[PDB]
Design a protein around this motif. Structure first.
Motif, PDB file in Angstrom:
ATOM      1  N   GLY B 331       2.824  -5.608  -1.158  1.00 52.13           N
ATOM      2  CA  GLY B 331       4.054  -4.833  -1.195  1.00 52.13           C
ATOM      3  C   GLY B 331       4.820  -5.135  -2.462  1.00 52.13           C
ATOM      4  O   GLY B 331       4.415  -6.028  -3.239  1.00 52.13           O
ATOM      5  N   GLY B 332       5.910  -4.403  -2.692  1.00 52.13           N
ATOM      6  CA  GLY B 332       6.567  -4.453  -3.998  1.00 52.13           C
ATOM      7  C   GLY B 332       7.967  -5.007  -3.979  1.00 52.13           C
ATOM      8  O   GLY B 332       8.801  -4.646  -3.111  1.00 52.13           O
ATOM      9  N   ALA B 333       8.254  -5.886  -4.934  1.00 51.28           N
ATOM     10  CA  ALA B 333       9.620  -6.277  -5.243  1.00 51.28           C
ATOM     11  C   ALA B 333       9.885  -5.617  -6.570  1.00 51.28           C
ATOM     12  O   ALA B 333       9.473  -6.108  -7.627  1.00 51.28           O
ATOM     13  N   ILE B 351      10.242  -1.644   4.911  1.00 50.29           N
ATOM     14  CA  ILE B 351      10.422  -1.349   6.350  1.00 50.29           C
ATOM     15  C   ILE B 351       9.216  -0.611   6.881  1.00 50.29           C
ATOM     16  O   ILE B 351       8.681  -0.941   7.936  1.00 50.29           O
ATOM     17  N   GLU B 352       8.744   0.371   6.125  1.00 50.44           N
ATOM     18  CA  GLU B 352       7.611   1.162   6.594  1.00 50.44           C
ATOM     19  C   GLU B 352       6.270   0.457   6.438  1.00 50.44           C
ATOM     20  O   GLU B 352       5.422   0.529   7.310  1.00 50.44           O
ATOM     21  N   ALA B 353       6.076  -0.250   5.324  1.00 51.88           N
ATOM     22  CA  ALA B 353       4.860  -1.015   5.099  1.00 51.88           C
ATOM     23  C   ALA B 353       4.697  -2.083   6.165  1.00 51.88           C
ATOM     24  O   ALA B 353       3.579  -2.327   6.637  1.00 51.88           O
ATOM     25  N   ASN B 354       5.800  -2.737   6.522  1.00 47.89           N
ATOM     26  CA  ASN B 354       5.758  -3.784   7.541  1.00 47.89           C
ATOM     27  C   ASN B 354       5.227  -3.210   8.861  1.00 47.89           C
ATOM     28  O   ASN B 354       4.385  -3.806   9.506  1.00 47.89           O
ATOM     29  N   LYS B 355       5.675  -2.015   9.222  1.00 49.68           N
ATOM     30  CA  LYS B 355       5.144  -1.365  10.411  1.00 49.68           C
ATOM     31  C   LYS B 355       3.636  -1.199  10.339  1.00 49.68           C
ATOM     32  O   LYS B 355       2.921  -1.545  11.287  1.00 49.68           O
ATOM     33  N   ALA B 356       3.143  -0.692   9.201  1.00 50.48           N
ATOM     34  CA  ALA B 356       1.722  -0.437   9.053  1.00 50.48           C
ATOM     35  C   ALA B 356       0.924  -1.742   9.040  1.00 50.48           C
ATOM     36  O   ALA B 356      -0.143  -1.823   9.631  1.00 50.48           O
ATOM     37  N   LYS B 363      -3.212 -10.095   8.070  1.00 53.15           N
ATOM     38  CA  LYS B 363      -2.937 -11.535   8.140  1.00 53.15           C
ATOM     39  C   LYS B 363      -2.105 -12.038   6.951  1.00 53.15           C
ATOM     40  O   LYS B 363      -1.396 -13.032   7.062  1.00 53.15           O
ATOM     41  N   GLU B 364      -2.173 -11.325   5.834  1.00 58.31           N
ATOM     42  CA  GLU B 364      -1.504 -11.757   4.614  1.00 58.31           C
ATOM     43  C   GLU B 364      -0.852 -10.603   3.899  1.00 58.31           C
ATOM     44  O   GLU B 364      -1.501  -9.583   3.625  1.00 58.31           O
ATOM     45  N   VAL B 365       0.399 -10.826   3.518  1.00 57.18           N
ATOM     46  CA  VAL B 365       1.156  -9.894   2.711  1.00 57.18           C
ATOM     47  C   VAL B 365       1.567 -10.664   1.463  1.00 57.18           C
ATOM     48  O   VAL B 365       2.077 -11.794   1.543  1.00 57.18           O
ATOM     49  N   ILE B 366       1.323 -10.033   0.324  1.00 59.49           N
ATOM     50  CA  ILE B 366       1.694 -10.547  -0.986  1.00 59.49           C
ATOM     51  C   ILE B 366       2.745  -9.599  -1.549  1.00 59.49           C
ATOM     52  O   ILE B 366       2.465  -8.413  -1.745  1.00 59.49           O
ATOM     53  N   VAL B 367       3.945 -10.115  -1.796  1.00 61.57           N
ATOM     54  CA  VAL B 367       5.009  -9.337  -2.420  1.00 61.57           C
ATOM     55  C   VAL B 367       4.901  -9.524  -3.920  1.00 61.57           C
ATOM     56  O   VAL B 367       4.995 -10.648  -4.400  1.00 61.57           O
ATOM     57  N   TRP B 389      11.569  -8.785   2.874  1.00 59.45           N
ATOM     58  CA  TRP B 389      10.211  -8.997   3.367  1.00 59.45           C
ATOM     59  C   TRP B 389      10.073 -10.208   4.286  1.00 59.45           C
ATOM     60  O   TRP B 389       9.326 -10.159   5.267  1.00 59.45           O
ATOM     61  N   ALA B 390      10.765 -11.303   3.981  1.00 55.14           N
ATOM     62  CA  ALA B 390      10.729 -12.495   4.840  1.00 55.14           C
ATOM     63  C   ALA B 390      11.298 -12.161   6.231  1.00 55.14           C
ATOM     64  O   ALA B 390      10.704 -12.501   7.258  1.00 55.14           O
ATOM     65  N   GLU B 391      12.427 -11.479   6.254  1.00 52.84           N
ATOM     66  CA  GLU B 391      13.032 -11.107   7.545  1.00 52.84           C
ATOM     67  C   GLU B 391      12.104 -10.189   8.324  1.00 52.84           C
ATOM     68  O   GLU B 391      11.902 -10.328   9.534  1.00 52.84           O
ATOM     69  N   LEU B 392      11.499  -9.247   7.621  1.00 53.43           N
ATOM     70  CA  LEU B 392      10.584  -8.346   8.277  1.00 53.43           C
ATOM     71  C   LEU B 392       9.402  -9.084   8.862  1.00 53.43           C
ATOM     72  O   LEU B 392       8.995  -8.822   9.990  1.00 53.43           O
ATOM     73  N   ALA B 393       8.864 -10.033   8.111  1.00 52.08           N
ATOM     74  CA  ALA B 393       7.751 -10.831   8.541  1.00 52.08           C
ATOM     75  C   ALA B 393       8.058 -11.700   9.761  1.00 52.08           C
ATOM     76  O   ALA B 393       7.216 -11.839  10.657  1.00 52.08           O
TER      77      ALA B 393
END
Ligand SMILES: CC1=N[C@@H]2[C@@H](O)[C@H](O)[C@@H](CO)O[C@@H]2S1
Ligand SMILES: CC1=N[C@@H]2[C@@H](O)[C@H](O)[C@@H](CO)O[C@@H]2S1
Lengths: 623, 623
Positions: B331-333, B351-356, B363-367, B389-393
């Motif tokens: 995902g993007g910052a 918000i939308e990427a987190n849903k997907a 298992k892993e998200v890289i911002v 992203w941290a809150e979403l995670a």
């Protein structure tokens, strides 16, 4: 002077050339060979084969009388039916109308049959608003005025355009109608009908001229067929693909009555096993059938600015004659290596190329004055090279170059050759091309000097300082061209001080000599910054005299960046000297050779001719 | 505070984090879920699943207490096993050790497990002196120091390198040993043993680190197989070529104990009919067999910063699942669009990427915090996006974003979000990415303003002026981040004046108002020039706080160029006003749309993110 046998047209041309010729109280009669001038005691008979040759004949008469000859006996048989000069108008410098007219006058006097302008995107096409946008593109009216002025001297006009690659300034525009024309990089999409629509638009523009001779380009399309073309069509025979596009363009040219020339390099690059130009290629039969059908419909132009021996050109002519008998040659007026030309190198290779052209039945030589990477060299920097090629063409020797040149320019040939000085480092082997310290010593950084291993600080600095002195005196006797010598005097002086400071910083920093660094920061730095500002001002005068305003902006960017970098170097040193920082990390880096192009020839200087690579090791155009 | 149950390592981290946590006179005891915090009356128990989650847990406690809670009862279950932040260190801005340490502290408090640096050429390889030359490349010692600081917080370190393309800063060097490694453009030559020698060198450098996890790159190698590869080998199956290269790279990684990730885009580009990423794939049988064996040995990273709906991400996950079940998400910052970030847009898409990512059991998200085209945005510009992203995670919502952000930064989330203001033009649809007037209003020319049709001269100017005022107040309460807000305040004020002048000169030239043109020339131009100088000075302070000095040079070049062009605009207007010239041809040119990227949306603003194309229509990097 009084005249018998002149037409009214020729009368008109002589009025325009009187300021060069100044014929005095003589009687000239115009009556087998390209040029003959004979007479004595105030009566001279001139004859010419092609009408434009009148103007070289009269230049020769003028030059003879000016040298103090009373008895004149001149006979020349030119080797080439056509001798052209092509000015680059695509590298940011678009020759203004006044300067085009001046160049035409000088070319007429030298014996050129043809004037050419190299225009990738710098002319107007109906319904193509982005083609030449903010580039100073020529209007149809401007091209007609230039053509008509050449025609006044019975000279031809040949546009040199692009119908395949070298269109970067057009295809950069992020507009659907432009992007859909693209294959990859600077290359148009073969087989795309919107591309042939564009190309027909180019011919519609040029069809407003009288001329029906054109150079359609087609050089240096290295990745042709490998971009959007590959996505649409898959991998195809690229030699045949070139032939297909070429036939389409010739068909368009035919519709408008044009006869075409093209640069020849892509046939060799596409058929050679290592993709190079200087190659004897085997031609697949299917390609042979295609080339055999196109050889009588296009003139291939073998271009080569580099070889120091006749046999090296001869080999390439033999390679070409296996494809077509109709091979023209393009030789160099070296003005594409920064701010300073190389008339000396131009002379060296021209002597040998002329030998090869004569051996290989060349009927046309095109002298090309490219402007690579921003058009920083004066449009009139190469008058010596142009005279040299005319002498070679007409006399097969350079015995009369000074005598004739005085009429062409009003100044001494050897003086004018000194325009080259910022490239003429001591000890340089004369047969190595593109060695251009004039440009890279200017544009390299001060803190991170990427060309420093290619500079001999004391020897080179002394050469530049001596050169500034020499050119300061020459500019005082340079007549209407003084401005170009002033530019060069200033450049050489600036280079000398720039070396002194840059190399002095490296040495003093390595030794920890803050006293010497302080000396540089507080006295030499202001001087250098002012010299750069003053050089910018002089260069801008030169540019505005010769060119449309468009394109000067890139040089403003380059100079402004250099100035900001000089300021940074001062600030960083002041912080070190004061103890604000414990080191200058830039100055702790080992400087490496910038390239190895001339490593195996063992000299110190090199060729470096891309500003963005001279000026920084950082990214600057890439994402 | 007093701590029970901590290791010595954890005790040291608490001491370092007191300045953020401010726990005061309480007891915290370290004893089912990723995080639990429970207690009252000055005694709290914390627990974690992963050791680094200690630091988020303490952040949650700190936030709860600062909000006035006595009794605290918080549980979180993280959606992702790994949550990483990747900073760009290849776009000219190389993060300095002090800033890396600060960032790591902040990331630990937010809940990230992993810190990553993206280094194309910006690290040292034995016997590769041109690799990172004058770029501020990291030494092995520097990387070890950064990794160790992450490790002090039980965070991992993952270098993100390049083993195929995106190596422009290395391959530019005209050295035989560099040039022999090339395919085409920015792409290394697959199948060349000297390329595998280089790649093994990369792994030898990274093997000095503790980490054995690495991202090997392999994105955006668009012409792979079509340059020197094609000349050497003919036209090969390019999807197989990618697999062959990958297998060689994985074999090298294996030798050194590394587990690899790669960007996934080239598999899609080479196996779609359009050659695009966001596409369905036709996987040839032979490529399937190769992919099936390689999929077990590499994690594919699906990167996407652009979609405004879960479903669009889901479609891409589904396609990725055709190749492999082991898919990580990037995902993007948003900090790669000039000088100003877009945390607001980052929030919208996160918000939308987190849903997907949740739906697809990622298992892993890289911002990713890229720095495209010069690294002009602060390294700390995107702290809001990172908290989001941290809150979403951790919580699947943003209900506590402000409270937690106050711990991480010491400042108000909504204030910090105002750092975006130079991109937040009135009326912009929130779901369109890359709209970056912060940058293109700055760098466009004054005489030849290529972005002028995309500028609303009153509406945007008022917005920039309002934003300057807002940012000037926020900077006063921004503590240790005040410097990045000062940069933004200056930028916005400058853009307002720059618009006033640029549009004002078009208007006054058109209406022949030389009096007003003179007022602009004599009063406003010196003001603008000074503002650009001052902005350069403030930007340079920001840069030196965050980055190594290398790379600043490109920005000096860009600002120096702008300054010189501002001077030229004043001079050309002065010559017109004083009667020395009869027209200013620049101002007679019709200005066209710069691009049509957002034409279909009826938008005035656009995206324009290459300096060299914003600044001039002339050639500047091409020959
Ligand atoms: C045809 C030709 N194509 C190239 C030109 O674009 C350059 O300007 C010239 C000088 O470097 O070299 C070749 S000649
Ligand atoms: C993998 C990826 N490769 C590209 C990067 O080089 C850019 O920095 C980034 C932002 O434009 O976009 C994609 S993500």
């Amino acid at each position: 002077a009084t005249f018998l046998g002149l037409s009214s047209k020729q009368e008109k041309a002589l009025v325009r050339l009187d300021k060069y010729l100044n014929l005095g109280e003589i009687a000239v009669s115009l009556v087998a060979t390209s040029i003959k001038v004979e007479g004595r005691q105030g009566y001279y008979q001139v004859s010419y084969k092609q009408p434009h040759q009148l103007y070289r004949a009269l230049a020769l008469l003028s030059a003879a009388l000016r040298s103090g000859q009373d008895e004149v006996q001149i006979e020349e048989e030119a080797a080439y039916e056509d001798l052209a000069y092509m000015a680059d108008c695509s590298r940011n410098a678009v020759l203004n109308l006044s300067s085009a007219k001046k160049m035409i006058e000088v070319l007429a006097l030298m014996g050129y049959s043809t004037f050419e302008l190299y225009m990738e995107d710098t002319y107007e096409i109906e319904n193509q608003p982005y083609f030449g946008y903010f580039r100073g593109r020529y209007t149809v009216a401007e091209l007609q005025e230039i053509e008509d002025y050449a025609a006044d001297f019975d000279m031809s006009f040949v546009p040199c355009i692009q119908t395949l690659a070298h269109l970067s300034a057009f295809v950069k525009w992020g507009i659907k109608e432009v992007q859909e024309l693209r294959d990859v990089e600077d290359i148009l999409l073969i087989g795309e009908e919107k591309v042939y629509d564009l190309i027909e638009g180019m011919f519609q523009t040029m069809a407003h001229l009288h001329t029906r001779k054109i150079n359609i380009g087609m050089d240096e399309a290295h990745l042709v067929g490998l971009g959007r073309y590959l996505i649409k069509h898959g991998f195809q025979n690229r030699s045949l693909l070139m032939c297909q596009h070429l036939e389409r363009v010739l068909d368009i040219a035919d519709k408008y009555g044009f006869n075409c020339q093209m640069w020849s390099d892509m046939f060799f690059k596409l058929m050679s096993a290592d993709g190079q130009y200087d190659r004897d290629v085997e031609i697949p039969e299917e390609t042979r059938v295609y080339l055999d059908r196109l050889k009588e419909r296009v003139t291939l132009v073998y271009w080569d600015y580099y070889q120091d021996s006749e046999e090296k050109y001869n080999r390439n002519f033999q390679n070409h004659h296996k494809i077509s008998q109709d091979i023209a040659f393009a030789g160099g007026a070296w003005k594409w290596i920064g701010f300073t030309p190389h008339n000396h190198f131009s002379r060296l290779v021209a002597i040998e190329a002329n030998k090869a052209c004569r051996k290989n039945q060349v009927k046309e030589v095109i002298v090309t004055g490219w402007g690579d990477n921003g058009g920083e060299t004066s449009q009139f920097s190469v008058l010596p090279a142009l005279q040299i090629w005319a002498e070679l063409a007409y006399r097969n020797d350079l015995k009369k170059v000074s005598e004739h040149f005085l009429v062409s320019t009003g100044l001494d040939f050897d003086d004018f050759m000194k325009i080259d000085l910022a490239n003429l480092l001591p000890d340089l082997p004369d047969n190595l091309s593109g060695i251009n310290p004039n440009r890279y010593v200017l544009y390299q950084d001060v803190l991170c000097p990427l060309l420093e291993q290619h500079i001999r600080p004391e020897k080179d600095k002394q050469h530049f300082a001596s050169s500034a002195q020499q050119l300061g005196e020459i500019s005082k006797r340079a007549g209407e061209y003084a401005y170009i010598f002033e530019t060069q005097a200033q450049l050489n002086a600036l280079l000398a001080l720039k070396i002194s400071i840059t190399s002095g910083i490296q040495k003093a920093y390595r030794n920890g000599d803050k006293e010497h660094l302080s000396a540089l920061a507080e006295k030499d730095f202001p001087q250098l910054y002012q010299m750069v500002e003053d050089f910018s001002d002089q260069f801008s005068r030169q540019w505005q005299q010769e060119n449309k305003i468009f394109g000067l902006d890139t040089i403003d960017i380059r100079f402004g960046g250099l100035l900001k970098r000089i300021k940074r170097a001062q600030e960083r040193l002041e912080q070190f000297i004061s103890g604000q920082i414990d080191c200058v990390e830039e100055l702790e880096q080992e400087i490496l050779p910038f390239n190895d192009f001339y490593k195996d020839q063992g000299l110190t200087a090199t060729t470096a001719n891309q500003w963005h690579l001279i000026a920084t090791a950082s990214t600057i155009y890439t994402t």
